[PDB]
């Protein structure tokens, strides 16, 4: 709305910041960026911080968090973090254990959101994308909704306050939501959304559901090569966004995370440089009018920048469906 530390009630009664912290960087970025940025951003007022096990940042992640609830800056109440359970950990007896694994990276005792990253489970061990010789990712069968189950069974330990999904198709939804003795709904599903792939469909029937639609890849993605196309168009170089921005004395970035904000989305923003990281939290200190919502409407193309179709074959591969 118009205060930086807004949230939204999920639906086990826990609170979300509606602007969240996204932390991955690319390979070529030193690890020992993560540390910095994400000190800054807590500075800055950033409160949702997003992680990942995939992302390898979890312990550098983890120091900076404790760094700022150290100094004072802010309390671990205060801090909504959230990691994600990997492919390779999908089984359920192997569900704890990675949870347990990045919070000991962390070396906090609870993340605030647990999501399953991604529906399509891989061979267990430690490579995170198992490969045979060839090239060939080697995938597992694995019931989601045994996955489902354990993850389940971290909030019942209170090791995850509240748990989600990533990456799931309205199907994925529906087969967990119709799971017989379900015992907890996933109160998100944090997808790629942005200007470009507005999600209208999947946004509407997690709306039906009372599950919170979390934007990732926001402002365009890292565009980081294999996983983007080199060759898509750069979201932030948009004409209409820059139009926007020049209207409104703000940036192409601040229009796209402020126009999630305003059709109910929790909007993630993920920025390594410091200027840009105190910029984003400005979000809240404008409004776009009902008309220029509607432009950005208009600017949809179905430009999906990440596909992830590397893992295309297995019937989980989420974005085969409409949506
Ligand atoms: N669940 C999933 O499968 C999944 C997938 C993708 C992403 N995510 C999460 O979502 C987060 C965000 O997505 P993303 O990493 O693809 O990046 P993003 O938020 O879409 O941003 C892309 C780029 O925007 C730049 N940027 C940030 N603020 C800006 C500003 N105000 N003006 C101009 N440029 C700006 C950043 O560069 P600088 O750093 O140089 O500022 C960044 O590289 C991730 O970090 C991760 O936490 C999750
Ligand atoms: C957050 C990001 O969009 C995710 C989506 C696809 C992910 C990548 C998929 C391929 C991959 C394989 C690895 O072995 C290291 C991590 C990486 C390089 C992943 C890092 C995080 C990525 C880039």
């Known amino acids: 709305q118009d205060s930086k530390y807004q949230c939204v009630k999920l639906n086990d009664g826990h609170f979300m910041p509606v602007l969240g912290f996204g932390t991955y960087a690319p390979a070529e970025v030193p690890k020992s960026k993560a540390l910095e940025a994400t000190k800054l951003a807590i500075e800055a007022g950033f409160r949702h911080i997003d992680s990942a096990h995939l992302y390898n940042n979890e312990e550098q992640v983890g120091l900076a968090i404790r760094s700022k609830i150290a100094d004072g800056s802010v309390k671990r109440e205060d801090i909504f973090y959230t990691s994600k359970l990997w492919c390779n950990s999908?089984?359920?007896?192997?569900?704890?254990?990675?949870?347990?694994?990045?919070?000991?990276?962390?070396?906090?005792?609870?993340?605030?959101?647990?999501?399953?990253?991604?529906?399509?489970?891989?061979?267990?061990?430690?490579?995170?994308?198992?490969?045979?010789?060839?090239?060939?990712?080697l995938f597992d069968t694995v019931d989601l909704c045994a996955t489902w189950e354990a993850v389940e069974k971290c909030k019942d330990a209170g090791l995850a306050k509240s748990i989600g999904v990533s990456n799931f198709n309205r199907r994925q939804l529906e087969m967990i939501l119709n799971k017989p003795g379900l015992k907890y709904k996933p109160v998100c599903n944090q997808v790629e959304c942005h200007?470009?792939?507005?999600?209208?469909?999947?946004?509407?029937?997690?709306?039906?559901?009372?599950?919170?639609?979390?934007?990732?890849?926001?402002?365009?993605?890292?565009?980081?090569?294999?996983?983007?196309?080199?060759?898509?168009?750069?979201?932030?170089?948009?004409?209409?966004?820059?139009?926007?921005?020049?209207?409104?004395?703000?940036?192409?970035?601040?229009?796209?995370?402020?126009?999630?904000?305003?059709?109910?989305?929790?909007?993630?923003?993920?920025?390594?440089?410091?200027?840009?990281?105190?910029?984003?939290?400005?979000?809240?200190?404008?409004?776009?009018?009902?008309?220029?919502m509607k432009a950005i409407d208009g600017l949809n193309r179905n430009v999906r920048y990440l596909t992830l179709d590397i893992f295309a074959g297995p019937p989980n591969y989420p974005f085969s469906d409409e949506y």
């Open 195 to 292: 200007p470009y792939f507005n999600q209208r469909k999947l946004l509407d029937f997690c709306k039906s559901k009372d599950i919170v639609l979390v934007a990732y890849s926001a402002l365009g993605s890292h565009r980081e090569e294999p996983w983007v196309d080199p060759n898509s168009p750069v979201l932030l170089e948009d004409p209409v966004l820059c139009a926007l921005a020049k209207k409104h004395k703000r940036t192409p970035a601040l229009i796209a995370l402020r126009y999630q904000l305003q059709r109910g989305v929790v909007v993630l923003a993920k920025s390594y440089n410091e200027q840009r990281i105190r910029q984003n939290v400005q979000v809240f200190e404008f409004q776009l009018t009902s008309e220029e």
């Open 90 to 137: 999908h089984r359920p007896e192997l569900v704890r254990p990675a949870l347990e694994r990045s919070l000991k990276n962390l070396q906090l005792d609870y993340v605030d959101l647990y999501l399953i990253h991604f529906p399509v489970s891989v061979k267990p061990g430690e490579e995170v994308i198992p490969k045979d010789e060839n090239g060939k990712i």
